[PDB]
Write a protein that binds this ligand. Structure first.
Ligand SMILES: [Mg+2]
Ligand SMILES: [Zn+2]
Ligand SMILES: [Zn+2]
Lengths: 1342, 90, 99
RNA sequence: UCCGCGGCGCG
DNA sequence: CTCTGAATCTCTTCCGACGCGCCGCGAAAA
């Protein structure tokens, strides 16, 4: 029907407004109080919009369908449906034009920049505070020149009436009708050509692009100022009949009434030639009313109703969280839905949920109608509803029949990630609560404290099949965030399993040997033996061969009875060893994942359900309970407390002696209290975990304590050692609300009685945590919304692009600790190239091979240390990413399918854990390994030691197998006692330098001669307290003489004869340069050796906010300056606080110049030759420079490292693919440096894909592409700057986006998910994708 | 009764192709009255369509063959009917 | 409580909100994102035009369910047209190209 | 009789 | 010494989870 291909948006001339109009409103009246009827020519004028009763004229001349389209004669009401009252729009014709508020207040003001006039003047003239000259000839007054009233008098008396100067709206309209697009365009182009100041160039170019867009759109600037105002159809602004004959009205009625009043007042004033003062005042009032109607609150004191509340303008109706978009487009309320409190279900099968009878009946009422009529038990809908409403038995029978196989959707608010809504087969259950399977409830992040869940129903069989295929719970075992299982036992299930997997030294029937698990169950059920007996059992097992068959075997193994009984339900195929240990929660998860990988879905789900049942049964049987005596208090607690009290008393006494400072005393008191807390905690743990049992031989022996509290704590189900410390030990130090730690810790535990003071201390931390999470939820939700908005477009489109570019992945190691092994990182990725066997030319793994588990084992066996993999950051494709470039799905355990929308998955996965994210010299080798150095340049002193001459060297420890396990940064000038390739043992210090002292090295031996060294002007002589030696301190530019600033201090190396020693490898003399405040202890002529230093120069991030800023890429406070181009360094004149520094390329003829804040600590020296992107100044680094200098891959790696580190610190697991996807989304904008043969314009920020395609086709034609750089933009900016303007308007700042699109006149092509959602047609993702493929055929066919 | 579609997933090769093919077949089932190729077991149209799609020798190309045969035979029937009308006129 | 079919808001023709009004549940944009995470296209389309807005669509769906055919007949949401008219009231011409 | 606002509570 | 251009300050502009129950209020005109 409508099947509209696109949407067009542009400014509307008054002509088309009149075309839309079906008359004009002329009276500020709505309905008669006496008779609730629409007025004659008011806001509900029937003869303008339509009748109130369907096909019924107001005068009653016609009341039947036969009069369809008949227009009344008596009162002029056409006979049609009442619904038309939503379509025809009114209009009002104003005596004098007035501007449109957005085109003025929305910065930047389009009107002002179009006119090249500042906004202040525009406002002043608009509200009639000054005059502006439309036309001036021989008058010595310029166009656009503003004159005030007395200036107006002077001009008129000095020039008669030759000039024309007027008030705001009309004159603005005139001059808009008095401008030449192309002439001003070419003039501005010439100005841009001749300009010198960059800022003026930017102003000129923004004006140029605005006027160019206006020209291309064809809209007239005269339309920019309103004269005829459309009137919203009355039905959208109803009049609710309130009780007692009153009414409830929208603010829109008030705004329109005020506007009507002002307009009619203005016209009645105008027609009789009133004095100019009052007419101008009333015109100003009319303009104010128009502004209030459009956007109240956009200027000054907003007009308000009696409630002293702002009136909802149209902008308010569109903007805002409660605005039209978020309230009615993306948040529609739907029918065939219900909600209820949830309750546990311990017997439901995993793929089904319990459903209350009454709610199910209400929901499926239409289906009952349909089938009942189909079975003919009633003749009509009326009889059907009468029969169902009294709940006959046949009603219930039909309800049972209808729902036998009919999935329903269960959802819980908020919907953090894709598991927040899942499908379930319903089973009808008497009651009023929804029963759920425990595993799904745990996966839901839902607790039964009274949380409510909503339920929906898919009507169409297509939707039902879709729900069965994907939304069914069974098919969602692996979290899309990361391939780990999400359906995991928790609480009592884990408790029971851990109880059943333990073992005691001496138990009933211990030492017997059984046949099989059958006998184990029989023996236990008879009670003849405990679950904990250590017994021999003949167990059989199967194993998958190379052929996929289950080879059998059996043997007698020593295990526990519980282990055998548990193995009874283990699916056939898994190795027995997985169950021959104490099973923790993580152990259970790993075993379940192993089962899922080895076998199919059905064995895995059956295993999960049977585990649930068995664990519940034996947890109930065990009957673990909490007693008072369980919180055992170590006796030594009193001794530890006494020791701490004695030591703190001694500290206080010594502080009263003044021998220690208040801060030092505070610090040491903190430290000693912490040590005491650690001691008491370890005492508690040692007392708890271990228990002495009499063995079979009547002898005591230690074993794991069966204490219930410790049993819970170790099992990991709702227990952590910190809680146990607070339970049976000193809960320790607290934090003041400022974050400072109180000196006196809270000594007592919870079992011990708490002093009121201690409780009043702890409540500070408690309330701080509560408020923190209260704010954190909102902040995380906002960030997730932003990410979803940004990453909506990216959808898998092609299987393989064919690219060869990849990215390098290595395990992450800092401080000698492998934070993440390479195996987890690269599992499920796609190889960039064929990978060779390390050390050999044999290709270990071929290219474009999915790295499944076997490949992971193969590579880790071969001691692979670094790999290259295809990435989504470099998939050369348009409007999508190659499937091979994305790798294996994290959910379905295989390569992704064409049609999946990655971006939403990535955004949800990254945003969900935010609720847990918080928001408030000498190096000893850790291992026996081989020392290695990178980019290492070094010198050997006369002592034979190794000082370093490179500034960015890394020191690593590589194992004998070719793998690295340590990583450290080597400061320039540090001392190393071990060279590269040398084997060292653990604990060996091999790093030597002073962080506080900055040394400057000397290359070879000789004598140091000072040049430009003059006392007072450059240096000073002093007697140091440390050595008592005559020392020369280089004076800083501010401290030194102004004339001595030009005297740059320098040190040259001469031989024994005084001839300058030239640096090896160069002819230039060895010329070093001491900066300001540098200190040289030696004197002019003292002898030095190789590697001698004579300069002794003197030397947080919250979880969620840091992540947000990194995604937003806000500029770091101190940007670390980087090298634009490689080459030698050189210095020039000094500015006030700044210095001129020039990098001269080794071969490049263009030495780049830069200004450096001198008070910032520079690192490079003049004689240094550095590479592009080198860290000139140490400190925080902005991503933008990283991109512009090093490239995309460095940015990707840095961002991934930062985000992964933050989440690792908090303790959450996120796969890198999502971060890569986000980054790939952030880089869709490219600036055109040179167009080449392309049609684009220089300096234009365009889609990278667009320029990619253009250059591709140009080279296909043999033409010249366009030179371009890529830009990293903040998520908000990169989002609102997209092309599908509708999506951006839905996101935020609707005014700016709408105004820009209108003045540009864009044309969207419905390629965005949100776009199709708002339109309400099939999305180009998932199942619909193939349909749109057919669409791509049809549009090609047509 | 069905609990998982993994068998059908590997049978066809994709979730979405499965959805589309099964939906079209079940559409033919519900309004076309075409008897299923699999025993019913009182299951709904959705379940029986799923059973047919899993190794019941049904795919997109198979149903394309089916519909091609159907359109050919109904066009032949219409041609025969028009011929019979012409003969009656003659 | 549950709702099968009831009244609607006059302005937007969508089911009311609230148990006391016998209204229906909210389907937030979070849910839209969750569905989009899966290949949930048909379900989303069914919910967002047939169960909420399209009066002709919802009536036709109701009748089809009565006669036993579970076939969707999607149509243009009315709220979208409401937004169109509202924008037109701002003097900004918005049209649908290639109808 | 369909609306909005203010407060309260649940997650 | 005087002007021009870039930096710095001042002013303006946005935007701060999501469901869901309750309660009691809104408007008068001649
Ligand atoms: Mg709860
Ligand atoms: Zn009439
Ligand atoms: Zn690719």
């Amino acid at each position: 029907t409508e099947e509209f291909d696109a949407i067009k948006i542009a400014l509307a001339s008054p002509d088309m407004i009149r075309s839309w109009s079906f008359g004009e409103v002329k009276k500020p009246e709505t309905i008669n109080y006496r008779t609730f009827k629409p007025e004659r020519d008011g806001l509900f004028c029937a003869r303008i919009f339509g009748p109130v009763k369907d096909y019924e004229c107001l005068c009653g001349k016609y009341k039947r369908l036969k009069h369809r389209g008949v227009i009344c004669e008596k009162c002029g009401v056409e006979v049609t449906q009442t619904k038309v009252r939503r379509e025809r729009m009114g209009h009002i014709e104003l005596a004098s034009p007035t501007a449109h508020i957005w085109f003025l207040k929305s910065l930047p003001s389009r009107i002002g920049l179009l006119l090249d006039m500042p906004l202040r003047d525009i406002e002043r003239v608009l509200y009639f505070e000054s005059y502006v000259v439309i036309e001036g000839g021989m008058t010595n007054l310029e166009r656009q020149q503003i004159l005030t009233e007395e200036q107006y008098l002077d001009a008129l008396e000095e020039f008669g009436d030759e000039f024309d100067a007027k008030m705001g709206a009309e004159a603005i309209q005139a001059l808009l009708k008095s401008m030449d697009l192309e002439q001003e365009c070419e003039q501005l182009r010439e100005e841009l050509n001749e300009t010198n100041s960059e800022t003026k160039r930017k102003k000129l170019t923004k004006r140029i692009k605005l006027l160019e867009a206006f020209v291309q759109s064809g809209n007239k600037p005269e339309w920019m100022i309103l004269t005829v105002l459309p009137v919203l159809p009355p039905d959208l602004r109803p009049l609710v009949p309130l009780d007692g004959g009153r009414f409830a009205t929208s603010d829109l009625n008030d705004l329109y009434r005020r506007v009507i009043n002002r307009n009619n007042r203005l016209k009645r004033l105008l027609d009789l030639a009133a004095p100019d003062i009052i007419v101008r005042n009333e015109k100003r009032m009319l303009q104010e009313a128009v502004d209030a109607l459009l956007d109240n609150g956009r200027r000054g004191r907003a007009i308000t109703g009696s409630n002293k509340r702002p009136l909802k303008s149209l902008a308010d109706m569109i903007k805002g969280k409660q605005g039209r978009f978020r309230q009615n487009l993306l948040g529609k309320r739907v029918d065939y839905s219900g909600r209820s409190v949830i309750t546990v279900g311990p017997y439901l099968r995993l793929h089904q949920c319990g459903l209350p009878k009454k709610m199910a009946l209400e929901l499926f009422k239409p289906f009952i109608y349909g089938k009942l009529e189909l079975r003919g038990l009633a003749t009509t809908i009326k009889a059907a509803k009468k029969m169902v409403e009294r709940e006959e038995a046949v009603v219930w029978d039909i309800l049972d029949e209808v729902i036998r196989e009919h999935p329903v959707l269960l959802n819980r608010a908020p919907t953090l990630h894709r598991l927040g809504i899942q499908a379930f087969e319903p089973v009808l259950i008497e009651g009023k609560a929804i029963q759920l399977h425990p595993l799904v409830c745990a996966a839901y992040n839902a607790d039964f404290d009274g949380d409510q869940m909503a339920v929906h129903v898919p009507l169409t069989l297509e939707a039902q099949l879709e729900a069965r295929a994907l939304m069914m719970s069974t098919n969602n075992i692996l979290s899309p965030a990361n391939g780990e299982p999400i359906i995991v036992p928790s609480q009592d299930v884990v408790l029971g399993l851990y109880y059943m997997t333990r073992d005691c030294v001496n138990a009933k029937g211990e030492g017997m040997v059984l046949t099989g698990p059958k006998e184990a169950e029989r023996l236990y059920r008879s009670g003849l033996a405990s679950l904990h007996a250590r017994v021999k059992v003949r167990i059989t097992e199967y194993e998958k061969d190379a052929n996929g068959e289950l080879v059998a075997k059996t043997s007698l193994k020593d295990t526990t009875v519980g282990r055998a009984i548990l193995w009874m339900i283990v699916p056939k195929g898994l190795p027995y060893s997985i169950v021959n240990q104490a099973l923790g929660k993580k152990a259970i998860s790993k075993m379940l994942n192993t089962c899922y990988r080895i076998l199919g879905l059905k064995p895995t789900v059956i295993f999960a359900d049977q585990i649930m049942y068995t664990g519940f049964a034996y947890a109930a049987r065990s009957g673990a309970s909490v007693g008072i005596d369980d919180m055992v208090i170590p006796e030594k607690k009193h001794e530890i407390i006494s020791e701490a009290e004695a030591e703190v008393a001694e500290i206080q006494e010594q502080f009263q002696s003044g021998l220690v400072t208040a801060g030092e005393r505070y610090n040491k008191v903190i430290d000693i209290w912490a040590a005491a807390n650690d001691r008491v905690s370890k005492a508690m743990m040692d007392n708890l975990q271990t228990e002495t049992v009499i063995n079979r031989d009547g002898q005591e022996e230690k074993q794991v304590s069966f204490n219930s509290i410790y049993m819970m704590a170790d099992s990991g189900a709702r227990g952590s050692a910190a809680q146990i410390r607070q339970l049976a030990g000193m809960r320790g130090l607290m934090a003041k609300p400022d974050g400072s730690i109180i000196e006196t810790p809270i000594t007592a535990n919870f079992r011990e009685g708490l002093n009121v003071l201690q409780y009043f201390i702890s409540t500070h931390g408690a309330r701080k945590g509560l408020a923190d999470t209260a704010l954190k939820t909102a902040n995380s939700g906002y960030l997730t919304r932003r990410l979803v908005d940004v990453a909506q477009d990216l959808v898998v489109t092609e299987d393989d692009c064919g690219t060869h570019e990849g990215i390098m992945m290595t395990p992450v190691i800092e401080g000698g600790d492998v934070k993440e092994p390479l195996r987890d990182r690269v599992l499920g990725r796609v190889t960039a190239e064929d990978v060779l066997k390390p050390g050999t030319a044999d290709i270990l793994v071929p290219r474009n091979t999915l790295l499944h588990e076997q490949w992971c084992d193969l590579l880790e066996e071969n001691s692979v240390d670094a790999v290259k993999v295809r990435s989504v950051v470099s998939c050369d494709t348009d409007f999508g990413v190659c499937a091979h470039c994305y790798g294996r799905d994290l959910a379905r355990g295989h390569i992704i399918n064409k049609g999946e929308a990655i971006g939403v998955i990535a955004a949800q996965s990254i945003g969900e854990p935010g609720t847990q994210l918080t928001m408030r010299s000498s190096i000893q080798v850790k291992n026996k390994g081989s020392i290695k150095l990178s980019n290492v340049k070094s010198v050997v002193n006369s002592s034979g030691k190794l000082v370093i001459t490179s500034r960015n060297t890394e020191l690593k420890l590589i194992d004998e197998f070719g793998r690295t396990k340590e990583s450290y940064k080597v400061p320039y000038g540090a001392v190393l006692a071990k060279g590269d390739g040398e084997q060292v043992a653990g604990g060996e210090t091999v790093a030597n330098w002073d962080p506080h002292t900055m040394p400057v090295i000397t290359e070879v031996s000789g004598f140091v001669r000072f040049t430009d060294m003059i006392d007072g002007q450059t240096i000073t002589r002093q007697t140091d307290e440390l050595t008592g030696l005559s020392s020369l301190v280089v004076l800083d530019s501010a401290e030194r003489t102004a004339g001595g600033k030009d005297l740059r201090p320098a040190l040259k190396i001469v031989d024994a004869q005084g001839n300058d020693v030239l640096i090896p490898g160069t002819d230039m003399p060895a010329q070093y340069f001491l900066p300001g405040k540098a200190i040289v202890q030696l004197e002019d002529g003292v002898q030095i050796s190789s590697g001698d230093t004579l300069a002794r120069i003197p030397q947080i991030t919250g979880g969620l906010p840091r992540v947000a800023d990194l995604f937003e890429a806000r500029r770091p406070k101190e940007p670390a300056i980087l090298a634009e181009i490689s080459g030698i360094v050189s210095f020039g004149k000094e500015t006030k606080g700044k210095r001129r520094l020039v990098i001269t390329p080794v071969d490049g003829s263009d030495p780049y110049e830069e200004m450096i804040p001198k008070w910032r600590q520079l690192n490079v020296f003049e004689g240094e030759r550095v590479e592009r992107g080198d860290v000139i100044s140490d400190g925080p680094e902005a991503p933008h420079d990283i991109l512009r200098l090093r490239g995309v891959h460095a940015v990707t790696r840095y961002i991934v490292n930062e985000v992964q580190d933050v989440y690792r610190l908090q303790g959450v697991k996120i796969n890198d693919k999502h971060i890569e996807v986000i980054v790939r989304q952030m880089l869709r904008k490219a600036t055109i440096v040179n167009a080449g043969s392309s049609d684009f314009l220089e300096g234009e920020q365009v889609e990278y894909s667009r320029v990619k395609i253009a250059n591709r086709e140009l080279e296909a034609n043999g033409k010249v592409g366009a030179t371009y750089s890529r830009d990293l933009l903040g998520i908000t900016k990169a989002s609102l700057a997209t092309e599908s303007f509708i999506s951006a308007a839905s996101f935020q700042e609707t005014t700016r986006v709408l105004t820009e699109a209108a003045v540009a006149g864009k044309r969207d092509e419905l390629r965005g998910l949100k776009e199709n959602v708002i339109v309400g047609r099939l999305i180009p993702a998932g199942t619909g994708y193939a349909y749109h493929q057919d669409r791509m055929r049809r549009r090609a066919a047509g | 009764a069905r609990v998982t579609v993994q068998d059908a997933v590997e049978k066809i090769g994709n979730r979405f192709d499965l959805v589309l093919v099964a939906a079209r077949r079940a559409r033919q089932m519900q309004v076309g009255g075409k008897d299923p190729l699999v025993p019913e077991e009182n299951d709904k149209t959705t379940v029986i369509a799923l059973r047919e799609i899993e190794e019941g020798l049904i795919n997109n190309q198979i149903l394309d063959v089916r519909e091609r045969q159907e359109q050919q035979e109904q066009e032949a029937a219409e041609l025969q009917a028009v011929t019979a009308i012409a003969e009656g006129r003659r | 409580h549950a709702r099968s079919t009831g009244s609607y808001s006059l302005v937007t023709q969508q089911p009311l909100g609230g148990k006391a009004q016998f209204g229906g549940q909210r389907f937030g944009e979070m849910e839209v994102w969750a569905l989009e995470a899966y290949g949930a296209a048909y379900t989303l389309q069914e919910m967002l035009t047939v169960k909420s807005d399209d009066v002709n669509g919802r009536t036709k769906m109701y009748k089809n369910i009565v006669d036993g055919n579970h076939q969707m007949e999607p149509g243009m949401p009315e709220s979208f047209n409401v937004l169109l008219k509202e924008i037109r009231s701002l003097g900004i011409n918005i049209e649908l190209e290639d109808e």
